[PDB]
Amino acid sequence: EKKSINECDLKGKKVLIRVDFNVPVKNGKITNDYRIRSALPTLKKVLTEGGSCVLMSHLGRPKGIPMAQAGKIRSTGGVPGFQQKATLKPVAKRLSELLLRPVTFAPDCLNAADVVSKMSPGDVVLLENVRFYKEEGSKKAKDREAMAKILASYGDVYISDAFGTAHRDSATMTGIPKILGNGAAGYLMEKEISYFAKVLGNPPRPLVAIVGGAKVSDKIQLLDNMLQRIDYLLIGGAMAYTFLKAQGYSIGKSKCEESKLEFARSLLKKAEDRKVQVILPIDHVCHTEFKAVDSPLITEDQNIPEGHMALDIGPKTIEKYVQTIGKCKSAIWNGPMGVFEMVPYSKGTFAIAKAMGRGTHEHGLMSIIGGGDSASAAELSGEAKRMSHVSTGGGASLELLEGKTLPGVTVLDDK
Ligand SMILES: Nc1ncnc2c1ncn2[C@@H]1O[C@H](COP(=O)(O)OP(=O)(O)O)[C@@H](O)[C@H]1O
Ligand SMILES: [Mg+2]
């Protein structure tokens, strides 16, 4: 098992903490800071122990820029790879408010030596989005290490509290502990890993995996490796359209991974072979445009009219999904069933949340909800508190089904 912050000497040390501050943002504002709130304990620990924090995280999926191209930008005085919608700035502000102390925001994670050097115990520094640099997520270890070398020069001890990006073998996740030669798990990492651990071992079956949301291309690839664990696979959100089209239905202008259709088909084959009852939308809630509208189009078929885009699962689908969740003893959910941010497209998401919250509360249904947007929905409904666990990890919570040890976790000093 991995070493904890508890085992580290933090007094007077600059702790490099990789957190998951990839919170939901709209118009440059955080709409849900559950991922930040969840990281509070580890930061409190280091502050209480007399250390200082230099936090690293990513927001969104910015294009990134090669480190080489950065130098030129910095000469101009700009920020390498900067994308306004993916700044961690609002996160720095929020964190400062929760922590009740200043959080200095270093606008460039690879050019923060100055600020870092001036740190003293009690100080908290948040570096700009590490994903502003392509090397952070490069597949080329050489590349990751290049960037990690710099970041690693920022502190003494490293601790990872970013369960949520633990499935991401990245520069900040695995590269820094590698180059620094140490790494422990924060409290949140420990917590998530433990709850999942205890739960994924002896899950009360039937076990239904409800997966929705977006990020289809990546998320769809996690499904194959979770068929062995699950009994039911409910599919909603954008994820559904690729499956439905692969099956031969009309998808209209709905989100679809056209390059995954055969993959979808094969996965459905394996699902049958692995004794997994996969269920897709029966009907949909649609509209001609990605805009809310009181009373949008609700289909009868799995087919979506050419001019429409399905934005939520339909009533018949909500019924079957809720019904099957009722047939289970374990439920793992990731991804809203529709565009829950808009009232007319929120019924599916809140229905699943309700069923899970109710199942747990009235029958011990062991429920786990994961993901930033998912956590927001759970909180909006109020069912968050009624779940067995609401994880800060979405894809992380899904990858974890495969049984493999998350690289971010793995890289940690298992002591
Ligand atoms: N039918 C849909 N069409 C387009 N987007 C959708 C649809 N259903 C859900 N989404 C979007 O996908 C996002 C949530 O998915 P995802 O980001 O993968 O979730 P999480 O952060 O919980 O893991 C939301 O912004 C949601 O509106
Ligand atoms: Mg998201």
Side-chain angles (χ1 to χ4, degrees):
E1 165 54 52
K2 303 302 168 181
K3 173 174 188 172
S4 140
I5 7 182
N6 280 127
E7 281 78 270
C8 304
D9 173 14
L10 306 177
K11 189 82 59 188
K13 300 187 182 178
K14 289 176 183 186
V15 191
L16 259 36
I17 313 179
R18 213 300 188 177
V19 294
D20 188 5
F21 284 175
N22 187 27
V23 296
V25 292
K26 177 194 175 195
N27 291 136
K29 319 214 127 286
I30 302 158
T31 63
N32 180 282
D33 65 2
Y34 176 74
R35 277 178 170 153
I36 300 173
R37 277 181 276 117
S38 297
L40 292 186
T42 288
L43 299 190
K44 183 203 92 285
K45 215 283 186 294
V46 32
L47 294 178
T48 276
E49 297 295 300
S52 55
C53 311
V54 26
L55 322 177
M56 306 165 285
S57 187
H58 71 276
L59 187 82
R61 287 177 169 184
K63 267 72 273 165
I65 213 194
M67 272 168 72
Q69 298 176 11
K72 301 74 176 185
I73 312 286
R74 303 197 196 115
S75 306
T76 303
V79 181
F82 182 82
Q83 278 151 79
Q84 192 59 71
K85 3 295 161 304
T87 328
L88 274 179
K89 192 136 165 301
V91 174
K93 218 257 153 285
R94 183 66 124 253
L95 180 63
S96 178
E97 301 162 332
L98 300 172
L99 245 27
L100 304 156
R101 81 178 50 232
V103 168
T104 130
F105 185 64
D108 186 332
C109 69
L110 294 187
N111 190 30
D114 57 322
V115 175
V116 173
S117 75
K118 298 179 286 281
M119 292 175 72
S120 315
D123 284 2
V124 180
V125 157
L126 172 59
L127 302 177
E128 175 62 283
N129 196 334
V130 297
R131 280 189 185 169
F132 271 4
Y133 291 102
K134 294 201 177 70
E135 8 292 297
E136 213 281 310
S138 176
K139 323 81 243 140
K140 299 179 180 179
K142 57 191 177 74
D143 291 1
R144 297 199 300 280
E145 292 169 82
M147 182 183 188
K149 274 186 285 176
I150 308 178
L151 267 21
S153 79
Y154 290 153
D156 315 324
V157 20
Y158 171 101
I159 108 181
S160 187
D161 213 23
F163 166 88
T165 318
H167 59 140
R168 303 300 195 212
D169 176 10
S170 67
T172 55
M173 292 305 299
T174 49
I176 298 182
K178 155 207 302 180
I179 301 184
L180 197 63
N182 76 91
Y187 292 147
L188 182 63
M189 184 69 89
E190 279 176 72
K191 180 198 293 171
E192 304 273 5
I193 289 170
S194 297
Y195 182 99
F196 276 104
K198 67 92 175 176
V199 134
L200 292 197
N202 299 322
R205 296 198 171 275
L207 167 58
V208 51
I210 302 95
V211 26
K215 297 161 176 279
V216 187
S217 59
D218 321 84
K219 203 181 287 188
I220 198 168
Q221 310 209 56
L222 314 182
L223 295 179
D224 269 348
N225 44 283
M226 67 175 86
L227 300 173
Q228 327 67 31
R229 324 283 256 76
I230 64 175
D231 299 312
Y232 286 92
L233 177 56
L234 296 187
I235 292 172
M239 172 71 82
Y241 313 119
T242 301
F243 280 101
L244 291 177
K245 201 198 183 88
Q247 289 182 133
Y249 297 94
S250 294
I251 256 46
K253 293 187 295 185
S254 307
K255 194 281 163 297
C256 161
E257 287 309 291
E258 295 287 339
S259 60
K260 244 63 174 66
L261 297 172
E262 292 195 315
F263 190 88
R265 256 179 264 115
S266 201
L267 193 158
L268 290 181
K269 243 55 168 292
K270 314 185 195 71
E272 292 183 75
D273 294 1
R274 312 309 232 92
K275 287 201 55 205
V276 186
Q277 189 183 142
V278 171
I279 304 177
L280 281 156
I282 280 173
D283 53 349
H284 312 278
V285 181
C286 323
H287 187 51
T288 57
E289 54 189 346
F290 202 96
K291 288 190 183 58
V293 62
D294 307 62
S295 313
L297 174 74
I298 137 72
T299 71
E300 294 298 329
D301 263 357
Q302 289 95 129
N303 299 288
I304 293 142
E306 346 80 274
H308 294 62
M309 49 178 56
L311 294 170
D312 193 14
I313 55 166
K316 286 177 292 194
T317 308
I318 286 176
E319 286 181 20
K320 183 65 186 79
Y321 284 22
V322 169
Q323 177 209 94
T324 135
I325 284 175
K327 300 183 294 193
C328 303
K329 271 157 56 193
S330 289
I332 297 181
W333 175 32
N334 173 239
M337 296 284 97
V339 183
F340 80 101
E341 296 95 344
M342 296 184 218
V343 172
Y345 312 136
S346 61
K347 291 176 174 187
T349 298
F350 286 145
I352 301 305
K354 176 146 146 289
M356 283 183 75
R358 184 210 188 219
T360 298
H361 174 72
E362 302 171 9
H363 310 93
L365 186 231
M366 190 271 291
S367 57
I368 303 176
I369 300 199
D373 303 295
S374 289
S376 307
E379 296 204 335
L380 238 4
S381 53
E383 296 287 356
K385 57 199 68 192
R386 309 225 298 177
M387 304 297 159
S388 308
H389 185 56
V390 40
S391 179
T392 52
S397 298
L398 290 179
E399 195 127 1
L400 212 41
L401 268 91
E402 185 179 11
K404 29 55 77 307
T405 46
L406 308 153
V409 177
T410 311
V411 74
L412 310 175
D413 296 358
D414 60 335
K415 289 69 208 296

